[PDB]
């Protein structure tokens, strides 16, 4: 890592290619008695985070060889991911690190899908659960929000083509939704309508669950009234044309919330 | 019991897949024959093959109805089942203003007015005219009725081909033909009568017909249609109009023959002043050169000069005492002209979209993982639509949707979506590797590593045209493998990466080595 | 003086009421035409005015014939000779009630679309109005008169259905290219600007271009020539709005849709100059080819 720093783009690309293989071997040098070590590779792990988000040009060379070969070992993933939740806590939301942040996360998750959306979504199964032992009024003024907040983006980004694993995690999946229909700023309710959207595309969209006919009807319906402006108001966004615009708006509260538009 | 588990228990293929199956027939047609006979099945596919044509050997702009069966109730039906009234081309051609009904003549009958020269020699504009005519004519040709040919300014590029010729002799119903009273020839041309020439057999009954009324001076139509009647082009009429008169003209040719020269604002006309056979008649001949086709003005001498006239083997010699006005009156309005037109544009071919969907899978996928989240859903639309209409195989993984939301890093997926394709449908890869090559040059960086990464599925497909028993796809082959070696070499960029896909990928494909390697030695020789 | 006003304005609009059951009626709508253009003091201001309701708004709709061939006829009057027209303020005047006046009497849109139609050859009409307007000059009065005659094209063309031209795709040809030179006091320019983007928009609604009749090359070069010179001018219009937001964002959603008709009617003559900006820098250009 430290001599990537200097080197030129040519011996770059050369450099990822040794690197690649020796990071199978960090599940050795986790879970062991001494945690002197175990900081090191969280701080190694840090030191790879600050590269990515460094580097432009390599960007998509980086994401395929580094992330794609840690989704593969399964051990790592979770201090993998929770050192992103700490990155994603790192500055502020709406910002370059969040934003690249949230694109290695399907990059992650490319190698290997079911235990990592598996992870993504029991860990906003247990952030929303947890919130039971402090209670208060409101989500937003709560103190786990934040991760409330990240991993729904996590969700979204990991949606488009099963990156969520679809055929096994939707009661899960839909769970969340309904907890989080109109909850929090413009941006959060935008996402979670794109999250409603692609959960329905990649529904009906893939060979895996091998559907009937009419089922692919009535869900192609289903996909359709969703895109109404009347669904817009239900999900509490108002006087947007695309949702999808304005999910990203970043990079380029007042309104009541009531329970029949939950029904 | 695993194996008992398993044991017990409206869609049109792309063009591609139906052309191979019709390559199948084709070379194997004799064989099949004796096979299937070991009938009415063959004899359908008999006919249907002819219908088709031997394997693939024309623009597909070219189609034809051909005349095995030709007859007029199929025509009819075939063109009102499809709708062609519909059709924007139809619409086009009647502002073309071919065939237009106009006036009544003084037996009473109307007349229809065919212009030659708004005709361009091509096969939608001769089918389209064809049934135009017989839409037009339709509801007057129980009836007797009357025509008018104008020839004007006829050449070559108005002709019908001799297929095509014949099939005007066969479409229309017999009283159709027999219901013409009167045929009025206007302006005919020694183009004209060298095309007669060509076609006396088809042209026999023709061939002396009383009904065929030369109009070899324009005050004898007003002897058959008053001229209130007449609704001939104004262009037709502004070459009588302000014409300088020059007679005592002769044409030296194989034959010397009297002529008059009547020079006008925009053209000249040598009208014949002795009469010559066409269709078994005795007439005038009247060639028209627009100021726009002549090439060359001289004078050899006041009593004889050449003129030259553009796509003419030899200038035309023309031999008078006043061939010196006669030039000085044609270079005039020529030179003018000649200031008056604008300069030479360079014109680019036709480009119609169900014959490029090479370029449109391209521009699809490229910007597909573009960053900007709009351009990406306008990519997923046109790839929907591109899998939708063209009738590409995708195992039904694209659905179009408004409000969809994309990832920056959406790469897997389009490679997946390359590799089916390329699975399902190999006709393509020539024009789809070709239009990748050209646009790497004007990509960005991570767009340049995305357009090796779903073109490298395609590299694989090129065993099925090389080798080929078409020599120019072979020689694409080596010329795509051209360009592959020039974007090696300059962009040092990348280079880890380019030889780790393409090259890596080419050379994991034995038979399809030897052609790599003696492009390689060709062009290290180069320099 | 103002009862005999009140009066006067009943009596012209009862019998431009009643003109249905009917000639005298010729010499009334003379009058009226003579009267438009009514500059006499201390009434006329109010005179023209009145004028311009009545016969705007209660016009009866079987009187529609007569009226439009009468202002034809007039405006036949205002070329001096040869395409060559001759300025004066009175015919400018005339002008500006004519176009109010075929607006309102377009938009009512009551019933009786029949007795519009079997008649009404307005294409010269409007010929004559835009070769007047386009030689008036450049300014503020002027760019006012310009632009409600571009409200007025693109009512006419909104209201295509129903009235008839004798040859339509010639007509709206000419149309286009009359208009498409007021492209390129600046607040009123882009309003102009802003205006006859709309008008063109609905000129080019499935519209075969064809080339003005010359010689020619061939009518297929004819077309692609305009095809480009049409395609070139959006271009640049579309890459100086690529740089008042609001005006901007409309002027390009309409140009936007320029291209789409403009594309959709002749593809066979347009794919070949606008394929290569598929890969263009600008990644609004791209984006709008790319659902085009
Ligand atoms: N090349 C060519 N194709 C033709 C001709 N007539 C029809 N076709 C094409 O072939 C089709 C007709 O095939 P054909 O074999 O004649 O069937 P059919 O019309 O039912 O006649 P049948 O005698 O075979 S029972 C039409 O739809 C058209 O596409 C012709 O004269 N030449």
């Given at each position: 890592?430290?001599?990537?720093?200097?080197?030129?783009?040519?011996?770059?690309?050369?450099?990822?290619?040794?690197?690649?293989?020796?990071?199978?071997?960090?599940?050795?040098?986790?879970?062991?008695?001494?945690?002197?070590?175990?900081?090191?590779?969280?701080?190694?792990?840090?030191?790879?985070?600050?590269?990515?988000?460094?580097?432009?040009?390599?960007?998509?060379?980086?994401?395929?060889?580094?992330?794609?070969?840690?989704?593969?070992?399964?051990?790592?993933?979770?201090?993998?991911?929770?050192?992103?939740?700490?990155?994603?806590?790192?500055?502020?939301?709406?910002?370059?690190?969040?934003?690249?942040?949230?694109?290695?996360?399907?990059?992650?998750?490319?190698?290997?899908?079911?235990?990592?959306?598996?992870?993504?979504?029991?860990?906003?199964?247990?952030?929303?659960?947890?919130?039971?032992?402090?209670?208060?009024?409101?989500?937003?003024?709560?103190?786990?929000?934040?991760?409330?907040?990240?991993?729904?983006?996590?969700?979204?980004?990991?949606?488009?083509?099963?990156?969520?694993?679809?055929?096994?995690?939707?009661?899960?999946?839909?769970?969340?939704?309904?907890?989080?229909?109109?909850?929090?700023?413009?941006?959060?309710?935008?996402?979670?309508?794109?999250?409603?959207?692609?959960?329905?595309?990649?529904?009906?969209?893939?060979?895996?669950?091998?559907?009937?006919?009419?089922?692919?009807?009535?869900?192609?319906?289903?996909?359709?009234?969703?895109?109404?402006?009347?669904?817009?108001?239900?999900?509490?966004?108002?006087?947007?044309?695309?949702?999808?615009?304005?999910?990203?708006?970043?990079?380029?509260?007042?309104?009541?919330?009531?329970?029949?538009?939950?029904? | 019991?695993?194996?008992?588990?398993?044991?017990?228990?409206?869609?049109?293929?792309?063009?591609?897949?139906?052309?191979?199956?019709?390559?199948?027939?084709?070379?194997?047609?004799?064989?099949?024959?004796?096979?299937?006979?070991?009938?009415?099945?063959?004899?359908?596919?008999?006919?249907?093959?002819?219908?088709?044509?031997?394997?693939?050997?024309?623009?597909?702009?070219?189609?034809?109805?051909?005349?095995?069966?030709?007859?007029?109730?199929?025509?009819?039906?075939?063109?009102?089942?499809?709708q062609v009234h519909e059709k924007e081309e139809f619409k086009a051609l009647k502002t073309?203003?071919?065939?237009?009904?106009?006036?009544?003549?003084?037996?009473?009958?109307?007349?229809?007015?065919?212009?030659?020269?708004?005709?361009?020699?091509?096969?939608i504009?001769?089918?389209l005219?064809?049934?135009?005519?017989?839409?037009?004519?339709?509801?007057?040709?129980?009836?007797?009725?009357?025509?008018?040919?104008?020839?004007?300014?006829?050449?070559?590029?108005?002709?019908?081909?001799?297929?095509?010729?014949?099939?005007?002799?066969?479409?229309?119903?017999?009283?159709?033909?027999?219901?013409?009273?009167?045929?009025?020839?206007?302006?005919?041309?020694?183009?004209?009568?060298?095309?007669?020439?060509?076609?006396?057999?088809?042209?026999?009954?023709?061939?002396?017909?009383?009904?065929?009324?030369?109009?070899?001076?324009?005050?004898?139509?007003?002897?058959?249609?008053?001229?209130?009647?007449?609704?001939?082009?104004?262009?037709?009429?502004?070459?009588?109009?302000?014409?300088?008169?020059?007679?005592?003209?002769?044409?030296?040719?194989?034959?010397?023959?009297?002529?008059?020269?009547?020079?006008?604002?925009?053209?000249?006309?040598?009208?014949?002043?002795?009469?010559?056979?066409?269709?078994?008649?005795?007439?005038?001949?009247?060639?028209?050169?627009?100021?726009?086709?002549?090439?060359?003005?001289?004078?050899?001498?006041?009593?004889?000069?050449?003129?030259?006239?553009?796509?003419?083997?030899?200038?035309?010699?023309?031999?008078?005492?006043?061939?010196?006005?006669?030039?000085?009156?044609?270079?005039?309005?020529?030179?003018?002209?000649?200031?008056?037109?604008?300069?030479?544009?360079?014109?680019?071919?036709?480009?119609?979209?169900?014959?490029?969907?090479?370029?449109?899978?391209?521009?699809?996928?490229?910007?597909?993982?573009?960053?900007?989240?709009?351009?990406?859903?306008?990519?997923?639309?046109?790839?929907?639509?591109?899998?939708?209409?063209?009738?590409?195989?995708?195992?039904?993984?694209?659905?179009?949707?408004?409000?969809?939301?994309?990832?920056?890093?959406?790469?897997?997926?389009?490679?997946?979506?390359?590799?089916?394709?390329?699975?399902?449908?190999?006709?393509?890869?020539?024009?789809?590797?070709?239009?990748?090559?050209?646009?790497?040059?004007?990509?960005?960086?991570?767009?340049?590593?995305?357009?090796?990464?779903?073109?490298?599925?395609?590299?694989?497909?090129?065993?099925?045209?090389?080798?080929?028993?078409?020599?120019?796809?072979?020689?694409?082959?080596?010329?795509?493998?051209?360009?592959?070696?020039?974007?090696?070499?300059?962009?040092?960029?990348?280079?880890?990466?380019?030889?780790?896909?393409?090259?890596?990928?080419?050379?994991?494909?034995?038979?399809?080595?030897?052609?790599?390697?003696?492009?390689?030695?060709?062009?290290?020789?180069?320099? | 003086?103002?009862?005999?006003?009140?009066?006067?304005?009943?009596?012209?609009?009862?019998?431009?009421?009643?003109?249905?059951?009917?000639?005298?009626?010729?010499?009334?709508?003379?009058?009226?035409?003579?009267?438009?253009?009514?500059?006499?003091?201390?009434?006329?201001?109010?005179?023209?005015?009145?004028?311009?309701?009545?016969?705007?708004?209660?016009?009866?709709?079987?009187?529609?014939?007569?009226?439009?061939?009468?202002?034809?006829?007039?405006?036949?009057?205002?070329?001096?000779?040869?395409?060559?027209?001759?300025?004066?303020?009175?015919?400018?005047?005339?002008?500006?009630?004519?176009?109010?006046?075929?607006?309102?009497?377009?938009?009512?849109?009551?019933?009786?679309?029949?007795?519009?139609?079997?008649?009404?050859?307005?294409?010269?009409?409007?010929?004559?109005?835009?070769?007047?307007?386009?030689?008036?000059?450049?300014?503020?009065?002027?760019?006012?008169?310009?632009?409600?005659?571009?409200?007025?094209?693109?009512?006419?063309?909104?209201?295509?259905?129903?009235?008839?031209?004798?040859?339509?795709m010639?007509?709206?040809?000419?149309?286009?290219?009359?208009?498409?030179?007021?492209?390129?006091?600046?607040?009123?320019?882009?309003?102009?600007?802003?205006?006859?983007?709309?008008?063109?928009?609905?000129?080019?609604?499935g519209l075969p271009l064809?080339?003005?009749?010359?010689?020619?090359?061939?009518?297929?070069?004819?077309?692609?020539?305009?095809?480009?010179?049409?395609?070139?001018?959006?271009?640049?219009?579309?890459?100086?709005?690529?740089?008042?937001?609001?005006?901007?964002?409309?002027?390009?959603?309409?140009?936007?849709?320029?291209?789409?008709?403009?594309?959709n009617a002749n593809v066979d003559?347009?794919?070949?100059?606008?394929?290569?900006?598929?890969?263009?820098?600008?990644?609004?250009?791209?984006?709008?080819?790319?659902?085009?």
């Amino acid at each position: 890592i430290s001599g990537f720093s200097k080197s030129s783009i040519e011996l770059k690309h050369l450099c990822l290619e040794y690197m690649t293989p020796w990071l199978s071997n960090l599940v050795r040098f986790c879970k062991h008695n001494d945690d002197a070590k175990r900081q090191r590779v969280t701080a190694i792990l840090d030191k790879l985070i600050t590269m990515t988000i460094n580097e432009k040009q390599m960007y998509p060379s980086i994401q395929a060889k580094i992330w794609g070969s840690l989704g593969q070992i399964t051990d790592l993933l979770d201090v993998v991911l929770d050192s992103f939740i700490k990155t994603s806590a790192t500055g502020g939301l709406g910002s370059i690190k969040a934003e690249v942040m949230a694109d290695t996360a399907v990059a992650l998750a490319s190698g290997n899908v079911k235990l990592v959306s598996s992870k993504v979504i029991g860990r906003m199964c247990k952030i929303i659960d947890k919130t039971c032992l402090s209670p208060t009024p409101t989500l937003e003024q709560h103190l786990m929000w934040d991760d409330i907040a990240i991993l729904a983006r996590y969700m979204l980004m990991l949606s488009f083509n099963n990156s969520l694993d679809v055929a096994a995690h939707l009661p899960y999946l839909f769970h969340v939704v309904t907890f989080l229909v109109a909850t929090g700023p413009l941006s959060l309710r935008a996402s979670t309508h794109g999250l409603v959207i692609n959960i329905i595309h990649s529904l009906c969209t893939c060979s895996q669950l091998h559907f009937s006919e009419e089922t692919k009807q009535v869900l192609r319906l289903s996909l359709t009234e969703f895109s109404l402006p009347k669904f817009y108001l239900l999900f509490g966004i108002s006087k947007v044309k695309s949702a999808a615009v304005i999910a990203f708006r970043s990079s380029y509260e007042r309104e009541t919330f009531a329970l029949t538009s939950l029904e | 019991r695993f194996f008992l588990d398993i044991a017990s228990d409206l869609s049109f293929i792309s063009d591609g897949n139906v052309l191979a199956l019709h390559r199948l027939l084709w070379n194997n047609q004799e064989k099949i024959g004796q096979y299937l006979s070991s009938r009415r099945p063959f004899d359908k596919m008999a006919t249907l093959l002819a219908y088709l044509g031997p394997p693939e050997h024309k623009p597909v702009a070219d189609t034809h109805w051909s005349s095995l069966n030709l007859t007029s109730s199929k025509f009819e039906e075939f063109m009102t089942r499809h709708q062609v009234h519909e059709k924007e081309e139809f619409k086009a051609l009647k502002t073309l203003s071919i065939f237009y009904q106009a006036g009544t003549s003084k037996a009473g009958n109307p007349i229809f007015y065919y212009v030659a020269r708004r005709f361009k020699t091509g096969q939608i504009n001769g089918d389209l005219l064809i049934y135009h005519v017989l839409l037009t004519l339709k509801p007057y040709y129980a009836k007797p009725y009357e025509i008018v040919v104008d020839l004007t300014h006829t050449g070559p590029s108005n002709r019908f081909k001799t297929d095509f010729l014949s099939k005007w002799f066969v479409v229309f119903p017999g009283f159709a033909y027999d219901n013409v009273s009167a045929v009025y020839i206007y302006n005919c041309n020694s183009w004209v009568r060298e095309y007669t020439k060509y076609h006396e057999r088809l042209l026999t009954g023709l061939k002396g017909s009383k009904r065929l009324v030369f109009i070899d001076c324009p005050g004898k139509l007003a002897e058959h249609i008053e001229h209130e009647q007449q609704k001939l082009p104004a262009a037709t009429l502004a070459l009588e109009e302000d014409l300088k008169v020059f007679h005592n003209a002769l044409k030296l040719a194989h034959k010397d023959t009297k002529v008059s020269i009547k020079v006008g604002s925009t053209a000249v006309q040598v009208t014949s002043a002795e009469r010559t056979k066409v269709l078994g008649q005795s007439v005038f001949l009247n060639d028209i050169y627009y100021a726009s086709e002549i090439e060359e003005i001289c004078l050899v001498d006041e009593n004889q000069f050449t003129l030259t006239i553009a796509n003419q083997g030899t200038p035309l010699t023309f031999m008078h005492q006043e061939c010196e006005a006669i030039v000085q009156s044609i270079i005039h309005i020529r030179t003018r002209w000649e200031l008056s037109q604008p300069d030479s544009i360079p014109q680019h071919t036709k480009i119609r979209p169900k014959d490029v969907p090479g370029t449109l899978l391209n521009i699809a996928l490229l910007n597909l993982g573009s960053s900007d989240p709009s351009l990406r859903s306008a990519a997923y639309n046109l790839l929907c639509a591109l899998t939708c209409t063209f009738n590409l195989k995708i195992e039904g993984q694209l659905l179009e949707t408004s409000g969809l939301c994309i990832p920056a890093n959406n790469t897997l997926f389009i490679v997946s979506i390359s590799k089916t394709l390329a699975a399902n449908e190999p006709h393509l890869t020539l024009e789809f590797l070709e239009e990748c090559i050209s646009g790497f040059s004007k990509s960005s960086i991570e767009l340049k590593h995305l357009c090796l990464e779903y073109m490298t599925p395609w590299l694989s497909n090129l065993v099925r045209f090389c080798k080929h028993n078409d020599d120019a796809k072979r020689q694409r082959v080596t010329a795509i493998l051209d360009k592959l070696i020039t974007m090696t070499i300059n962009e040092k960029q990348m280079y880890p990466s380019i030889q780790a896909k393409i090259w890596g990928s080419l050379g994991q494909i034995t038979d399809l080595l030897d052609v790599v390697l003696d492009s390689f030695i060709k062009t290290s020789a180069t320099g | 003086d103002t009862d005999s006003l009140q009066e006067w304005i009943n009596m012209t609009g009862f019998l431009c009421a009643l003109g249905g059951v009917c000639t005298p009626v010729s010499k009334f709508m003379d009058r009226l035409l003579s009267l438009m253009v009514c500059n006499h003091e201390k009434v006329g201001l109010q005179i023209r005015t009145n004028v311009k309701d009545l016969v705007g708004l209660e016009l009866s709709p079987a009187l529609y014939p007569m009226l439009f061939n009468k202002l034809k006829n007039t405006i036949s009057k205002f070329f001096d000779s040869q395409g060559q027209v001759l300025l004066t303020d009175t015919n400018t005047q005339f002008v500006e009630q004519t176009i109010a006046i075929m607006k309102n009497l377009l938009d009512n849109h009551t019933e009786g679309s029949s007795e519009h139609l079997g008649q009404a050859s307005i294409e010269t009409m409007m010929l004559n109005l835009v070769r007047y307007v386009r030689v008036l000059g450049n300014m503020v009065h002027a760019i006012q008169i310009k632009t409600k005659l571009c409200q007025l094209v693109e009512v006419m063309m909104a209201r295509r259905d129903d009235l008839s031209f004798c040859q339509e795709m010639k007509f709206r040809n000419k149309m286009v290219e009359y208009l498409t030179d007021w492209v390129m006091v600046k607040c009123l320019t882009r309003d102009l600007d802003q205006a006859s983007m709309e008008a063109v928009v609905s000129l080019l609604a499935g519209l075969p271009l064809q080339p003005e009749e010359g010689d020619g090359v061939e009518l297929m070069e004819a077309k692609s020539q305009l095809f480009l010179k049409y395609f070139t001018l959006f271009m640049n219009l579309l890459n100086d709005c690529s740089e008042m937001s609001r005006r901007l964002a409309s002027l390009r959603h309409c140009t936007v849709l320029a291209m789409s008709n403009l594309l959709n009617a002749n593809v066979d003559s347009g794919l070949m100059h606008s394929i290569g900006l598929g890969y263009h820098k600008d990644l609004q250009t791209r984006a709008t080819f790319m659902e085009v």
